C-alpha cells in the first residue's frame, strides 16, 4: 500500500518531464536516481527497475540519432554504465531474480544496438546474470525458469564473436546439467541444442552456426537423461518431447538428424506406451504422440 | 442533331418498371440483372456506362422502346453506332443526371427492389441499423438486396469495424448508397412493414418474428 503507490509515481515522473533532447532525458534519469534511489531497502527494490528500462530506451534513442550526434557511441556507453551501477544497487539491496533479468534485457539491448566498444559490454551484462545465477538461485522450480530465460535470451543475440560465443554456449551446458531434478536436466539440456544451431554470432556475416554435429551431442545427452528418469510417465513424455525436438531439427534442413535415429526413437515409444495405466495423465501423452504421427505423416 | 439526353427518361423509366415488377416476379428477376449490370460497371469510364445500358436494349424495349430509338436516316455524322456511344444519347456531364447519379440511383432501386418481397427479419434490420451500419447489412444480405461486394459494384469499399468492444461491422460507401439514399430505403422498409402489419389483425408469426428481431440482446 505505501510500497505500491510510490512505485507508480516514479513511472509517472520520468515521462512528466520527458523531453526530446536526449541529453536532457539523461539528466532527468540521473536526477531521478539521485532522488528516488534513496529511502532504505523498501523503495530502492521496486523503484529503480523503471529507470533501468527507461535508460535502455534512451540508449535506443541515441541510435536513432545516427547522424545528428557524433558522441552517440560514447553516450551509449555512458547509459549502459548507468545501468550497471543501477542494477548493482539492487543486488546491494539483496535481490536475485529481478536484477538477473534486468541485466539480460540490457544484454539484449546493447546486442541489438551495436555500438563502439559494445561486445565488451555485451559479455559483462550476460556473465553478471550468470554470476547471480549460480551465486543466488536455489529452488529447482525457479532455478529452471531462471536458466531457460538465459538460454533463449542468448539464443537470439547475433552481436557476439566466436571468440566470446563459445564460453557462454557451454557455460549454459554446465548450468543445464547442474539442475537438481532429472526431467528438468533432460529438457534443459535439449533446450541447449538450439544455441549450437540457430544461436547467431557475427562470423559468417550475421548468419546461423549450422553446426549440426553439436546439436546431436546435446540431443543424445538428453536421451541418456531420459532413461535416468525413474517414473514410466516421465520417461515416455520425455522421449516424445525429445522426439518432436528431433523432428524440428530435421525440418530445418539439418542432415545431421537422420531417419535411423527417428524410427528407432519412434519404435521405442510405440512399445513403451501401453504400460501406463488407463487414466487422465495417460490419456494426454497418447494424444501427443498421435499428433506427432500425423505431423510427420504429411511431412 | 439530337440535343436532349435520354438520361432523365431512362432514370424515370426504371421507376416505372420497378413499379411493374412489384407484382410481376418474372420481370423482377429480369430487372435485377439490368440493375446489377449498371452497378458493376464504372461511371468514371464514359463508354462502358453507355455500352452496358445499350447492351440491355432487349430489356429497354420490353416496357418502353422509345428510350433506345432515334431516326438513323437523313442525319450525316450521326450514324446508328455513333449515337449509342455519343454524348448525345447520354451526356457524360449532364448537370443533374450525371452518370455517377444514375449509378447512385441504380443501387437505391436495387435495394428497394429486393426489399419488396423480403422477409420480416430483413425489414426490421434495415430500420435498426444506422446509415453506416445499414450499408454493411446490405452486403450481409447478399445477393437478395443486390450484389454489393468489392468487385461486383464499382464505388463499394472494404467493410470496416468499430472500436466499440463488440465491434459492429460498418460501411462508409457514400459514393453509391448516399446517407440521403439509405434514408429513402429505410422509409420504404417501414412502408413495407407497416402496410404488411395491418393485414393480420390478431396474433400469428409476424408478431412472434418481429419480437425476435426486436428483443435480440
Amino acid at each position: 500500500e505505501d510500497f505500491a503507490d510510490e512505485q507508480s509515481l516514479v513511472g509517472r515522473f520520468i515521462h512528466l518531464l520527458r523531453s526530446e533532447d536526449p541529453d536532457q532525458q539523461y539528466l532527468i534519469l540521473n536526477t531521478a536516481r539521485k532522488h528516488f534511489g534513496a529511502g532504505g531497502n523498501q523503495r530502492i527494490r521496486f523503484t529503480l527497475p523503471p529507470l533501468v528500462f527507461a535508460a535502455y530506451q534512451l540508449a535506443f534513442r541515441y541510435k536513432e540519432n545516427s547522424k545528428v550526434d557524433d558522441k552517440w557511441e560514447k553516450k551509449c556507453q555512458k547509459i549502459f554504465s548507468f545501468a550497471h551501477q543501477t542494477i548493482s544497487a539492487l543486488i546491494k539491496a539483496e535481490l536475485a531474480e529481478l536484477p538477473l533479468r534486468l541485466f539480460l534485457q540490457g544484454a539484449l539491448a546493447a546486442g541489438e544496438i551495436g555500438f563502439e566498444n559494445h561486445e565488451t559490454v555485451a559479455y559483462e551484462f550476460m556473465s553478471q546474470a550468470f554470476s547471480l545465477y549460480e551465486d543466488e538461485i536455489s529452488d529447482s522450480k525457479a532455478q529452471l525458469a531462471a536458466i531457460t530465460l538465459i538460454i533463449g535470451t542468448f539464443e537470439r543475440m547475433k552481436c557476439f564473436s566466436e571468440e566470446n560465443h563459445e564460453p557462454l554456449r557451454t557455460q549454459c551446458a554446465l548450468a543445464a546439467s547442474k539442475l537438481l531434478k532429472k526431467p528438468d536436466q533432460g529438457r534443459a539440456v535439449s533446450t541447449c541444442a538450439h544455441l549450437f544451431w540457430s544461436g547467431r554470432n557475427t562470423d559468417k556475416n550475421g548468419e546461423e552456426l549450422h553446426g549440426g554435429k553439436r546439436v546431436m551431442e546435446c540431443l543424445k545427452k538428453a536421451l541418456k537423461i531420459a532413461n535416468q528418469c525413474m517414473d514410466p510417465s516421465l520417461q515416455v513424455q520425455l522421449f516424445i518431447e525429445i522426439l518432436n525436438r528431433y523432428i524440428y531439427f530435421y525440418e530445418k534442413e539439418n542432415d545431421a538428424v537422420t531417419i535411423q535415429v527417428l524410427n528407432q526413437l519412434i519404435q521405442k515409444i510405440r512399445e513403451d506406451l501401453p504400460n501406463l495405466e488407463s487414466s487422465e495423465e495417460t490419456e494426454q501423452i497418447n494424444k501427443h504422440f498421435h499428433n506427432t504421427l500425423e505431423h510427420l505423416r504429411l511431412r | 442533331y439530337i440535343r436532349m439526353a435520354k438520361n432523365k427518361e431512362f432514370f424515370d423509366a426504371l421507376e416505372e418498371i420497378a413499379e411493374s415488377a412489384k407484382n410481376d416476379e418474372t420481370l423482377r428477376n429480369e430487372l435485377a440483372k439490368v440493375l446489377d449490370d449498371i452497378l458493376k460497371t464504372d461511371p468514371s469510364d464514359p463508354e462502358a456506362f453507355r455500352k452496358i445500358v445499350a447492351e440491355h436494349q432487349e430489356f429497354w424495349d420490353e416496357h418502353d422502346p422509345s428510350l433506345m430509338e432515334f431516326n438513323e436516316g437523313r442525319f450525316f455524322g450521326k450514324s446508328r453506332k455513333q449515337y449509342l456511344k455519343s454524348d448525345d444519347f447520354l451526356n457524360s456531364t449532364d448537370p443533374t443526371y450525371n452518370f455517377q447519379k444514375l449509378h447512385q440511383f441504380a443501387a437505391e432501386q436495387r435495394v428497394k427492389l429486393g426489399l419488396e418481397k423480403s422477409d420480416t427479419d430483413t425489414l426490421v434490420a434495415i430500420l435498426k441499423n444506422n446509415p453506416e451500419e445499414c450499408r454493411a447489412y446490405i452486403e450481409s444480405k447478399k445477393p437478395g438486396l443486390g450484389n454489393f461486394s468489392e468487385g461486383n459494384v464499382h464505388g463499394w469499399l472494404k467493410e470496416e469495424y468499430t472500436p466499440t468492444i463488440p465491434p459492429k461491422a460498418i460501411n462508409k460507401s457514400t459514393g453509391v448508397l448516399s446517407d440521403e439514399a439509405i434514408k429513402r430505403i429505410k422509409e420504404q422498409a417501414r412502408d413495407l412493414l407497416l402496410l404488411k402489419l395491418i393485414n393480420s389483425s390478431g396474433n400469428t408469426q409476424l408478431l412472434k418474428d418481429l419480437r425476435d428481431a426486436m428483443s435480440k440482446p
Binding site: 505500491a4 512505485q7 507508480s8 516514479v10 513511472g11 509517472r12 515521462h15 527497475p49 523503471p50 528500462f53 535502455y56 530506451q57 535506443f60 533479468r101 534485457q105 539484449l108 539491448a109 546486442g111 541489438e112 525457479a142 525458469a145 531457460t148 530465460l149 538460454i151 533463449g152 539464443e155 537470439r156 533446450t191 538450439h194 540457430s198 516424445i240 518431447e241 518432436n244 525436438r245 523432428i247 524440428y248 525440418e251 530445418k252 494426454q284 494424444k287 501427443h288 499428433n291 506427432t292 505431423h295 504429411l298 | 469495424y161 468499430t162 472500436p163 466499440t164 468492444i165 463488440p166 465491434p167
Partner: protein
C-alpha cells in the same frame, strides 16, 4: 462469447499505464473470458482484469512478480480447445515450428503466444495461433515498431472471429480474421 486476449503490459517496469483509448474501451460488463499472456506484472493489473470479466486466465511471464501464476495453461471454451503461454518459454523466441511443436504437445485448436510485443494471427496445418502483442505497447530490445494491441475473439461455436485492436496514431484501427474448426 467474447474472449479478451492481451498481454505484455510491464507495469510499472516499462510503461506507466495502458493507452487512454484502450482503458476507455475496456469497461466491466462486456467480457466473459480473458486470456492474458502476462508481464502484468503487479497485483494492480490482476485486480483490473478481474473487474472486466468473471473468468480470467493469466499465465506466468518472464517479469511477473507473482509466483502462483501458471507457466503453461489450456482451456476449453465453446467448441474450441485453446492453449495459452507467455512465449519466452518457447525457443527460439517466437519461431514458427517451435510454436507448432508446442501445439502438438498441448493438442489445441488455438494457441496464444506473446513476449515479442508484436501482433500476429494465422492458420497453419488446420490449427490457429494468436499473439495480441503489447497492450501497453512497451519497450522491446528486438523490435522498435511497437503498436499497442489486444485481441477479442467471438467464438460463436465451431466459428471464431478474431478481432485485433491496434492503436496507430491516436485512432483505434481494428481489423478482423475469421477462423473455423476443421
Amino acid at each position: 462469447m467474447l474472449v479478451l486476449v492481451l498481454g505484455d503490459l510491464h507495469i510499472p517496469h516499462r510503461c506507466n499505464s495502458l493507452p487512454a483509448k484502450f482503458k476507455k474501451l475496456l469497461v466491466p460488463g462486456k467480457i466473459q473470458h480473458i486470456l492474458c499472456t502476462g508481464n502484468l506484472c503487479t497485483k494492480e493489473s490482476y485486480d483490473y482484469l478481474k473487474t472486466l470479466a468473471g473468468d480470467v486466465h493469466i499465465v506466468r511471464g518472464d517479469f511477473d512478480e507473482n509466483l502462483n501464476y501458471p507457466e503453461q495453461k489450456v482451456v476449453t471454451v465453446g467448441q474450441f480447445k485453446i492453449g495459452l503461454i507467455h512465449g519466452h518459454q518457447v525457443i527460439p523466441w517466437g519461431d514458427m515450428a517451435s510454436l507448432a511443436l508446442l501445439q502438438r504437445q498441448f493438442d489445441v485448436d488455438i494457441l496464444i503466444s506473446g513476449h515479442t510485443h508484436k501482433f500476429e494471427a494465422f492458420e497453419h496445418e488446420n490449427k490457429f495461433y494468436i499473439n495480441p502483442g503489447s497492450a501497453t505497447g512497451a519497450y522491446n530490445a528486438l523490435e522498435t515498431n511497437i503498436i499497442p494491441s489486444f485481441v477479442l475473439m467471438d467464438i460463436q461455436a465451431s466459428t471464431v472471429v478474431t478481432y485485433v485492436y491496434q492503436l496507430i496514431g491516436d485512432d483505434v484501427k481494428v481489423e478482423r480474421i475469421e477462423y473455423k474448426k476443421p
